[PDB]
Design a protein around this ligand. Structure first.
Ligand code: 9R8
Length: 203
């Protein structure tokens, strides 16, 4: 298990997200679905010139999987996935510009315009686990409960084929995001034109 320190500006951003009073927390889902959509666009584009890149799975989609027993909301996609090196994700300029925009009157919902929307997951999650599998590499598990560090390890869990899975270990007061009606409402409000099927699993 390898432990790394976040870049100073990212640790500052994560503390801002965790500490700031901001009621509109539902925007985390739009950000994560947008990231999945980008990864799906990338495999779709790459697979035009190299169709063998789909040997690890032809279906391009997003699954939303709530689990009330584990208090987790999982966002799974069959996008391009990330190599250990990719897992390189640069965000310095975006973070600086976002924190500068907040000081000038922007709100936390504009986070995606700065390439750092992933960190909005910490509005609702005490811990985030990201499992990823790229064609050119092994399956990896990234994880952070903030506090300025994150870990990376080779993942021994169920093989994914290709893509990325974000597991949000929800905060005790944020279990509304495990409810079918609530997730449906959010997807309809913020992610209705995403160009891939979004399947909301039932428990
Ligand atoms: C821990 C950790 C490390 C790295 C990146 C993330 C962010 C993330 N959240 N949900 C995802 C779903 C994915 O399919 C990918 C994925 O497989 N890929 C290839 C991917 C897709 C989009 C981005 N962009 C989007 C615009 O802002 C800049 C980042 C970057 C890489 C990643 C993410 C999290």
């Amino acid at each position: 298990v390898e432990t790394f320190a976040f870049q100073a500006e990212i640790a500052q951003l994560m503390s801002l997200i965790i500490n700031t009073f901001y009621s509109n927390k539902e925007i985390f889902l739009r950000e994560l679905i947008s990231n999945s959509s980008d990864a799906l666009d990338k495999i779709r584009y790459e697979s035009l010139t190299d169709p063998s890149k789909l040997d690890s799975g032809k279906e391009l989609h997003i699954n939303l999987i709530p689990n009330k027993q584990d208090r987790t909301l999982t966002i799974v996609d069959t996008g391009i996935g990330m190599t250990k090196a990719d897992l390189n994700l640069i965000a310095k300029s975006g973070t600086k510009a976002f924190m500068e925009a907040l000081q000038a009157g922007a709100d936390i919902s504009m986070i995606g315009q700065f390439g750092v929307g992933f960190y909005s997951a910490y509005l609702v999650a005490e811990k985030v686990t990201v499992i990823t599998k790229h064609n050119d590499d092994e399956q990896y598990a990234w994880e952070s409960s903030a506090g300025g560090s994150f870990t990376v390890r080779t993942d021994t869990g169920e093989p994914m084929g290709r893509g990325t899975k974000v597991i949000l270990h929800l905060k005790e007061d944020q279990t509304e995001y495990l409810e079918e009606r609530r997730i449906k409402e959010i997807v309809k409000k913020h992610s209705q034109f995403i160009g891939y099927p979004i399947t909301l699993f039932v428990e």
